[PDB]
């Protein structure tokens, strides 16, 4: 199952100044970029057009080009409409796309955040506020819901265009999506808030896809103190992760770091301290 996410970030500093920047993700791989500075959407993969014809893509891009200009003016007008309730600066974020399921099933979404809080979604045939949203948004919602033309376009984008487009992306991008890249590991140590303790670190870098297993071990004994950090990105669309273990000084000998990953084909990495 793959989640396709179009992420829009719009900054409005005052009545005049604004910028909108967008990035598009299929799972954890970037497929598009659209800088405020660019008239056109940029492909970040050879296969980013999916299975759309040039005419289909040009038409879709045109719709987005009109959207970006229109969106900018609409926010500026909505600010005037709610004045002086809401003032600049304002950040608006959109997360739109679809989650793809086996055998023609999918679910689409369009979520909107205002000053970093999820307040609005498109659902069914209209815009609605979500639980916890402030009441003043009822007027913007009323105004947005008066626009039958936007409602029809969004319904089509979410219900039809998104799943169809992504199905083609998954076919076109298969070899990248299914790539296997091997982890490389290395060990190191530091002192950590310690009377006489140390912190061993097992570094694992360059693996794809994300799922990985990293454990400190003495023989066959999985050391339960193993703390694995967050998954951190490398610039080459691989992943980095480190697993730490807080141990007593002069008790490092015997410890090893074991790494299991789909790319290794059963041949685990074992690094002895």
């Amino acid at each position: 199952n793959y989640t396709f996410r179009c992420l829009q970030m719009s900054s409005f500093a005052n009545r005049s100044w604004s910028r909108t920047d967008s990035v598009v993700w299929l799972g954890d791989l970037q497929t598009h970029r659209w800088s405020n500075d660019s008239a056109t959407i940029s492909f970040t993969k050879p296969w980013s057009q999916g299975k759309l014809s040039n005419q289909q893509w040009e038409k879709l891009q045109h719709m987005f080009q009109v959207y970006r200009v229109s969106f900018t003016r609409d926010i500026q007008e909505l600010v005037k409409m709610m004045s002086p309730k809401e003032d600049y600066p304002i950040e608006i974020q959109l997360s739109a796309g679809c989650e793809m399921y086996p055998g023609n099933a999918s679910e689409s979404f369009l979520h909107v955040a205002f000053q970093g809080k999820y307040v609005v979604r498109f659902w069914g045939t209209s815009w609605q506020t979500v639980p916890g949203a402030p009441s003043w948004l009822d007027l913007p919602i009323k105004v947005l819901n008066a626009d039958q033309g936007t409602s029809a376009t969004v319904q089509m984008l979410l219900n039809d265009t998104c799943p169809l487009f992504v199905r083609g992306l998954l076919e076109a991008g298969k070899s990248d999506l299914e790539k296997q890249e091997k982890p490389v590991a290395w060990l190191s140590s530091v002192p950590s808030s310690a009377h006489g303790h140390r912190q061993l670190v097992c570094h694992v870098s360059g693996f794809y896809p994300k799922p990985v297993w990293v454990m400190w071990m003495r023989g066959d004994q999985e050391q339960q103190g193993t703390h694995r950090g967050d998954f951190l990105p490398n610039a080459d669309e691989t992943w980095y992760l480190q697993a730490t273990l807080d141990v007593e000084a002069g008790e490092e000998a015997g410890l090893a770091c074991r790494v299991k990953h789909s790319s290794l084909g059963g041949q685990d990495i074992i690094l002895y301290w």
Partner: T-cell receptor, first 111, second 114 residues
Amino acid sequence: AAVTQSPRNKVAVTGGKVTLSCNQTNNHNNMYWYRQDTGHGLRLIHYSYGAGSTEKGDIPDGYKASRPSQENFSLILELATPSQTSVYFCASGDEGYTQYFGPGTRLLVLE
Amino acid sequence: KTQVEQSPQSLVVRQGENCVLQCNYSVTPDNHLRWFKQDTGKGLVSLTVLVDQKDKTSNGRYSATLDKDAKHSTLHITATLLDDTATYICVVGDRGSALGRLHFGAGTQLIVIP
């Protein structure tokens, strides 16, 4: 949805103060002032999204707008000039795109 | 010069003749297009509003077309009467809500000889 304007006709002198008034009982949030001049389409001067709101349109210079209530939207020419000789139209609307226009006001500013 | 252009600027027809009025625009986006009739020194009377990509409307002797791809509309008046003597104004609304701006043509003056 009806809209009224007063006065319907006005002769003024350069440097004098002129107030054009528009009234609507539709409970419309939104009101709009335009002028119509020969060789041009109607051009937006000022508009308002509710009591206390006034916003500049395309050609706001030399005009002040006033929205004291939901019902009333005024266009104020503090220092009238001959260039403001025109036909002025007010409109109102709700959240929908339709603007409901008043019957117009003819203003002549003499030297 | 402007985003909405009307043609002809003016025309003279005899009673009972048909005529066709043109509106061409560059406005983007184009949510809807309305035709107004304005009698001399009077107000704006809506004749029709066109909303679809390829639209046709009618209202008595008035009929209109809109082609949003060509950004072109025509107003047809069948069997003109003296009372059709007026200015006819094309206006494009750029939104399907109050967030829209109206873009007005400068009008076509029709005189009908009785």
